[PDB]
Design a protein around this ligand. Structure first.
Ligand SMILES: O=C(O)Cc1cn2nc(-c3ccc(Cl)cc3)ccc2n1
Ligand SMILES: O=C(O)Cc1cn2nc(-c3ccc(Cl)cc3)ccc2n1
Ligand SMILES: O=C(O)Cc1cn2nc(-c3ccc(Cl)cc3)ccc2n1
Ligand SMILES: O=C(O)Cc1cn2nc(-c3ccc(Cl)cc3)ccc2n1
Lengths: 133, 132, 132, 132, 132, 133, 132, 132, 132, 133, 133, 132, 130, 130
């Protein structure tokens, strides 16, 4: 019952990335535990509370973005720890266009930890290295 | 949480095993299929036990130099009673080629899974300083 | 300890006044003879609220710019009942000329003294990035 | 303000203990739970005696080097009768490997607590040039 | 080999499909699970049909600029009657933002598999110029 | 019968990499078709005949190397085209020590095409991008 | 050596055809299977008329620019009565976007074949400054 | 065509003489008045074997160094029966001062003329990397 | 001593005269034969009142931008009843062309002589920031 | 006697420079007020106590140096303030030999303030800008 | 009459520079032998035919320019070779205004060889080094 | 004309005299009042024989290293019976400190006058490579 | 001596003429065959007033921006009663393109010769920046 | 004039003394109160022979390496019969640390005064490189 339960983790994580790409902070907040933590390049090597720090990027950038972007989770690896917690790690490739309209690509590595709280998977901790995008 | 104190101590034993170069103690604490993101892996996800064998066999074993690792303000997410996630800034004091004390910072995420009363290391993510 | 929860509260009230440009609340919480080490002072110790008043009086009209400040892991040393000391990493999110968000880090030490049942800011030391 | 002259002297003994490398006198004068912001800690707050014990034990290639430390215009805030806060510019004169005289500047804040009958160092903040 | 002439012509139809931006003609010629190494993929192996859809939809379709692709001295390895491997230097003439003709070189390996009389593109490897 | 026949390709390709690492040009020549072709950084963007061009590196470098090196083929992908030809693609991570003895890592991407000639798999074409190592 | 003066003239008509952008006269004077080494081809040998047709058709923003080409000390090797090889330094005087006069140097080898009653250009090699 | 296989043979014999330092075989295959464009000539056309003799006479004692030269995709233009023209990419593998192998690329055009039933080298043009 | 504060105040009046651009009040406070070392004088000793007039008449008089000057830890040497020497770090807060608050440091020695009944500025030496 | 006093300041200042050039710290201390202050490039923009800070330079550089040096005071200007106070300002040109033994030149600007205490002139404050001695 | 001849070369050379400064190519051609040669910075180290190569500069730069220019011949040295030949060498200082209208100075070194053909002096070869006109 | 070859040869004898360092033969061929423009003269016109003596006596005389000089496409202007002007590109092949063959280009104008019965060098102008 | 202050006087009149751009007053004080070493001449000795008139006619005369010149500690060598040589550091305060005051230093040697009853400037040497 | 060639003669003797490092001959030809502008003085006017004696005593006297100095097109201003001013480009050929010949250019103004029956060097101005 793992191959399908892994597909459950892949689904909820891909929906989270879709919310980030579109700038939908409301769905982002629902899917994230209020006390989620984050390591990311924008945090300058510090561990921050995930939902307060990221609201600045949603409210001033990602809600305003209208440019075409394509995100690819390359060969995701999923660790199941029982039935109420999961860890997913993957290379995130982002395709976009610059100001000049010429195509560019950025890579980052993302770890995201999920916890089933009241039958809903909640994002509890993330670690991103690589490109800030 | 008294449970949080438990995760901190087992993570320090993993780090102390790394500092001493004890690859046997390291392997016991790790799930055989553990995965790793780290600067030495150049942005790839590696199998932690195959990739790290090069560093035990060629770097940390002789311990010809004093090394000190510090966990700064570790944050622990408990997912039930069988799973934990610990994140912290890792400060490493070491001696360079000249024998001068230096400091390096990295950020580490480590995920643990309790199987039959024993915590097993399942995934790690380190960013920051390339060398370790 | 709420005795320590008292120091963080008065310290965060000071930080909020800085972001909004509230010089009146700043002056109430600061002893008139407070001293400061900070990057803007070019390695010198500056006394009283005179050095800081310049930034309040000349950067308050740009409050159109959205900024968000984050305190991180405050550590408090208590020396008796009329004295304390708080240290923390200060994270500031802001927008540059191009409208793109950036982040800045600084380290802040702030010393407090109980005068008339009223905490007064007596000395500060900031290193890192200048206040954006 | 004779108690300020007491702080000036006890602080100079701490600096000379650092200059000479006398770690056991360093430990005498420092509270075991002191915290530190310093350039070597890369913008993090460290636990004082664990982090600093590494520099004392490994900086043996410098004892045969003359250094002179100066505290410039120290400013002392007295908080009651059992706590004191001293801030000063630290100028260090030394010789390099090439034998040529050099000067380095740093800014230091140090907080002291009168414990029992002796003053104890509880927190430090140094910005500027690294002590190593 | 008259067989070698067959591989060259089908590879040019794939390239001509890319030059025109015809994503439907491209997909017909490609195995659904084709893999790709290319500069835009930043050193990763991607699924060619998901990753390339961004380039068809945003770059090569409008054909507002004349483009010319050349296969220079293609070398074909025939592995029986069902498999072929073709390698060649790919020269692309294009117009820059200023409308000036420019030239870019890349090296391409493309592997083909004949299923039911139809050649299907199974794997490609491009190195050299990042943009295409 | 593919999961095991893929393991056949993985074996012969890993033996080829072992021959390159040790500098054994004789086993390298046996496993390579005499007319193999190569795209590699050292060839400066040209397609070269594989066995003549690489003998310079075996005879002057890789036969003389005694330093510890570790090669990892990360998540290899194998395309089977019938029963007499295969294509394998993988990220190649190389761990080594420099002159100073401090650890380093290099990444390259490798495509290698194999052809079963007289029941023996023969290396017919390679394409490497990334680091020259 | 009057046939050398014939080569000098037919070669100058080829250059002026390039200078004026007259591609159809270019095609008249060139053998359909000519090969070329030139800076724009990035060190590759290209098939002559397919590669060059792109520069004629897209360099329309320059016809309203005066240029003067000079062949310096041309050396002509006659190989029988139906083939000739001419080598020369090519100096090009032109005006930039800013209107300031410039000079560019290249070295050109061009091989000619008397086909029927007219000389045909079969191979060229240019090193130095790119024609565009 | 063996008529073309004749040109490549005499051309590769010339290239072998250069690597070994065989000036005698070089002189036999070259017309005494041959001309050359090459990087070592700094953009000038140099006549006869005088310019090249300097490299043979002064770089023959270092033949201890191992070098391997590779020709790539020669293209031959025939103009009648007494004239030909061959172009190819020349790849040179060598060792630098540190003993590490390097590779260099150049592009070479060589023109041949049949004098007395004997192919004579009449003109060459090399661009790219200077002969190592 | 009150003589020190008298020197401190007359020196502050001079600096305020400079900040506002009041050359008439500046001249009143300066001996007609005052001398000056300063960055603007390029290492030469100038007559202070002739050299500084150019700065009052073309820069400082028209300045309507807010400026704040700080005199850090002034040290005063009293020589008798009619002579004083004051030395201090001079911190100047200002707004740049972009309206951003900036800080500049200079070190100033100023020598004063009470002739008759009024303190007169006789010599200055400034190192550090080029002011203007 | 205003010209007598200036010739006296000129002489006492020349004696101070002589003691510095030879490295005679004992004569240096005699001529300096115990509380003299100094602005100098070596002090990194801070005002130091002249006799404590300079002891390091006498004890480790100037006293042991026997290399040829020539110092040139250029256009000294003297302000007399009453009868017990003087200040002298001048450009100091220093000729010296570097490690290679080649002559070099350095310029500094020096202000020195003197105070007649008892029957002796005492150096009370100095300001040097330019090249670090 | 060796001094007469040098005054004659000095004058005929001054007429050549006048024609160049004004952009009068018709007077330029009259004074120059049809086969004159030139070494100049604009020729990129090659020997050109002076009258064909320079026509581009008269027709597109010098003839239309009316900016203030002042040319200064410095210490001209004249070698007389017989009665029909002369060579003059001199430093040429050129004062001009740039795009911003600020005066600038350029130096070049000029050798010019003259040949008395018929009753007229003809300019047969020039060599200029230094600043590209 | 044979007068051209006469000038060509006397000029080649001068250059060979320079290469070998024979100042006595150099002086024989030069008019005592010869003038020179050259890179070594830093844009000044010098007396050729006094200025060049320093190079013969300290560099060129002691040279035992192989050098080859090439006179490319010399152009000779004949002025009557006793005057000539020769212009040419001068290519110098030499070995550097490392023993590596190198090439330098300069452009030379040399003016010759047949006084009595011997050609005399009266003026030279060299641009390009600083020789030495 | 009275002669030395006379030299300082005529030299400041020359400098004032340069600052104001008065070429007519410049020509009166300078010998027609005066020579000059100066940065603008690129290391050459230039003879006469033509080289300097280019700067008067295209910059210095039309300049309305305020300039202040300072002659620092002039040294005067008197060679009899008909010739003198004055050397001094010249500090020039000016406004740049942005209108901000700037300072430049040069070193000037100027040689004067009393022909008839008028001092005439015969040679100058300036080092520093154009 | 005979006077101008006399000035060229004594000036070359001064230059030869500098090249050879003969400070004694240098002192004889120079007025004890001579002044100098030169790159080594960092833009200052230096008075007397002490500044130059540092270079004689530590370099120029002990120099055995061959040096050749060239005075290019000297211009001489005669100011009566007791004073002269000579200006010229000075080209110096020398050997560097590696022993390779090199060339440096400077511009020199030198003022001479005939006191009694001896020409004395009273002021010099050199621009270029130290
Ligand atoms: O942290 C401190 O206690 C010193 C301090 C306060 N500030 N406040 C500002 C600031 C205040 C108000 C506005 Cl609107 C904009 C900027 C800048 C620097 C600074 N240093
Ligand atoms: O805290 C300070 O006041 C700064 C500081 C810098 N340093 N630098 C040294 C030092 C550095 C390199 C060598 Cl080779 C020898 C000595 C010693 C003390 C010190 N303190
Ligand atoms: O083959 C040659 O002789 C070199 C060469 C360089 N160029 N450069 C130009 C050119 C470049 C930029 C602009 Cl904006 C205008 C004109 C034209 C011809 C040419 N030939
Ligand atoms: O390719 C050509 O026809 C011209 C040419 C020949 N050479 N030969 C050498 C060379 C010959 C012999 C030895 Cl041992 C070492 C080096 C170098 C440059 C070059 N250009």
């Amino acid at each position: 019952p793992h191959m399908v339960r892994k597909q459950e983790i892949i689904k909820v994580n891909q929906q989270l990335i879709e919310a980030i790409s579109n700038g939908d902070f409301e769905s982002y907040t629902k899917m994230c535990d209020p006390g989620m933590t984050a390591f990311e390049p924008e945090a300058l090597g510090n561990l921050v509370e995930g939902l307060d720090f990221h609201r600045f990027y949603f409210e001033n950038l990602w809600s305003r973005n209208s440019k075409p972007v394509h995100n690819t989770m390359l060969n995701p690896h999923i660790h199941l720890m029982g039935d109420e917690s999961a860890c997913i790690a993957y290379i995130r490739i982002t395709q976009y266009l610059d100001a000049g309209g010429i195509p560019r690509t950025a890579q980052s590595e993302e770890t995201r930890v999920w916890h089933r709280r009241d039958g809903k998977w909640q994002h509890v901790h993330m670690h991103r290295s690589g490109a800030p995008s």
